[PDB]
């Protein structure tokens, strides 16, 4: 098959999914841009 592959590691699939479902960072980002949209 193939759809089950695509974690098998097409491309740090592993360890991207892991490291953003644990990420921090992303919010601090998208933290800014909420205030700074809404003023």
Do not use: M
Not at 3 to 25: E, F, H, M, P, T
């Amino acid at each position: 098959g193939t759809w089950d592959d695509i974690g098998q590691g097409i491309g740090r699939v592993a360890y991207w999914v892991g490291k953003a479902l644990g990420n921090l960072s992303d919010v601090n980002q998208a933290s800014r841009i909420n205030r700074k949209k809404k003023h």
